[PDB]
Each structure stands twice: as C-alpha cells, then as structure tokens.
Design a protein around this ligand. Structure first.
Ligand SMILES: [Ca+2]
Ligand SMILES: [Ca+2]
Ligand SMILES: [Ca+2]
Ligand SMILES: [Ca+2]
Ligand SMILES: [Ca+2]
Ligand SMILES: [Ca+2]
Ligand SMILES: [Cl-]
Ligand SMILES: [Cl-]
Lengths: 174, 176
C-alpha cells in the first residue's frame, strides 16, 4: 500500500549566510521574496524503508506513485545556534505535488535536563514539516524547498530572523 | 587558529529499534547500559569550514581539522525529533585521536518556533537542546570512539514522547 517517507535536510546555515555576504547578494526579508540559493550546503537523509541513497543537494528515494514525502530540516547545530525552518514547498510538477506546511506542537516533547541530559523530561516544543505527494517517477525538475533562517543574538538566549531562502534539491523517485 | 566544527548526525530511530527487536537484542534501559548498535542507520553531516566529506558508507565522515580543534556532536531523528526522537548524552573513548567532554544541555529562553497554521510569522519560546564535544588530539581515525543517545517514541495520544531506551554507536571519524 502507501507509505510516508521522511526526508530530513541538514543545512549549513552559517555557510549560506556568509556565502551571500561575500557574493554581494542579500537575504530575502519576506516569505515570498526568499533568496534562491544553491544546493551546496544542503545534506539530505531519509528513513525510506523501500531503500534510498544520496552528493549534496541530491537524493534518490524508492517511492511509488501515491507515496508521501515529508520534508524536515535543521541547522548543523540542530537549531541550537543558527536555525532553519521549512515553511513552503513549490513546483515538482509532474513528479511531485507539494502540500502546505504542517506545524506540529507536542505538549510533552522529550527534552534533556541539565546537567547530564538524563533524566529526560517533557515540555511543549513546536516543529514544522511540509509534505509532497509522489505523482510520477523520475527526477523532479522544478521543485523548491523554502526555509526561514535564524541566528542567535548576543544575549545567547534568543534567535532572530535573518531572512528567507529557497533551494532546488534534486529528488529522484525510483 | 582553533575552531569548533559541528558534526550533525541524523538517526533513523525507527530502523534501529526495529532491527534490535528483529535481532532479539534488548534495548538498554539505563544510560550506563546503552546497547551497542551498528552504524548502518547513522548519517553524519558537518559545517566544517576547513572542508569535509561524507562516507560512501553511513557511520563514516572525514573532517579537516587540526589538533586543538573541537568537534561538537549534535543529533536528531529523520523527523527532526517530532515523532521518534534522539538526544546525545555522552561520548567515550577516542584515545589518542579524540578527547570527549561531558554533555551540554542548552536551554534557549526564546528559541525560534513555527506557529500554526502557516509556520510564519514565527515566534519564540523555551526549548532545550543537547550536544557533546570532543577535542581533536591527533589527526587520524578514531577506532574506540562511541556516541551515546537516548531514543524516544511518540505514544498513541500523539502528544507525548516516551523513553524507548539507550544506544551507543561507534562512528568512523577521520580527522585529516
Ligand atoms: Ca499537538
Ligand atoms: Ca554533567
Ligand atoms: Ca531539531
Ligand atoms: Ca575526556
Ligand atoms: Ca542558555
Ligand atoms: Ca496553512
Ligand atoms: Cl506549488
Ligand atoms: Cl572517555
């Protein structure tokens, strides 16, 4: 029958921001004017039980038409310094059909406690993912993942919006 | 010229738990009794400014680092800890290549958070993170180095995550 496949993207948020600095380009400041970036700093993995394999910006998934791809992301610090959140997927036609972002709030998500991690506790945490339906096997040509990027301010306690990016990962469905 | 290098591990928590029970192996229920697992379901990335490459095999990574550099290890499930979840709480071994420190639990008063139902406008709220360091003591490939994590599942109510158990794996880390 039909399954959901997690596609997790680790993002080098620092590299992307510092790249743009040196590249004389600037970061988009509205969700619609997200800066289009390479897939140089985009590292995908999956839980695909049907099997899968991965260069950066690329992934090959065994998926049937009717399967759902569920896109998750995080910075290389697991959003504890720089942070990234996906809010949108567009395109993919005819291979993928994006849905709208799904915000999950676990009222009791597992959380580490100081100063040893264990014993672990629970507390409210919010997460985001965005799904895409597999509509046709092949390499999706025109598929964009959109994410908001954040940095840690000098207080070391608050993360602030740095801007919006989008990238065009190469997703092969097989 | 010393720098901190992030090592992010994505973990297929489901596959690790399934294969363990399909293999008759108990899942460790105490932090000190974590079950040694293969590194088949371990996928590492980095932010290493000096460059890096990711193993044709999972459980491998090659990082450009110098002695005195610090590796900081982070992790999450394939669903970003929103269904199954994972948290590093310990690193052991590594002699003479890596020298682990003890776990650090980061609490951000105002971590960035998505809001329903559009994600944006984002908000902020308290969230906890864990990571653990190892100092680069000698270039080469660490053989005796273990990352330890607590694994969690999402119960039937879909609102609470519960402790499944503890595991440790021995990633192949090449410092070059
Ligand atoms: Ca909920
Ligand atoms: Ca401690
Ligand atoms: Ca995370
Ligand atoms: Ca030590
Ligand atoms: Ca703090
Ligand atoms: Ca919506
Ligand atoms: Cl669209
Ligand atoms: Cl040790």
């Amino acid at each position: 029958s039909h399954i959901t496949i997690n596609v997790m993207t680790v993002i080098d948020v620092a590299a992307i921001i510092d790249e743009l600095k040196a590249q004389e380009k600037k970061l988009g400041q509205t969700p619609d004017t997200a800066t289009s970036i390479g897939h140089k700093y985009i590292y995908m993995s999956s839980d695909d039980p049907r099997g899968w394999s991965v260069d950066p910006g690329n992934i090959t998934l065994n998926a049937h038409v009717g399967d759902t791809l569920s896109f998750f992301c995080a910075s290389t610090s697991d959003n504890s310094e720089y942070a990234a959140f996906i809010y949108r997927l567009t395109g993919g036609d005819p291979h993928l059909d994006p849905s709208h972002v799904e915000v999950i709030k676990l009222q009791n998500a597992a959380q580490p406690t100081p100063s040893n991690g264990y014993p672990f506790t629970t507390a409210p945490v919010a997460f985001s993912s965005c799904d895409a339906k597999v509509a046709q096997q092949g390499q999706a040509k025109n598929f964009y993942v959109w994410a908001a990027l954040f940095t840690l301010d000098d207080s070391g306690e608050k993360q602030v919006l740095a801007g919006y990016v989008k990238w065009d990962p190469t997703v092969n469905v097989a």
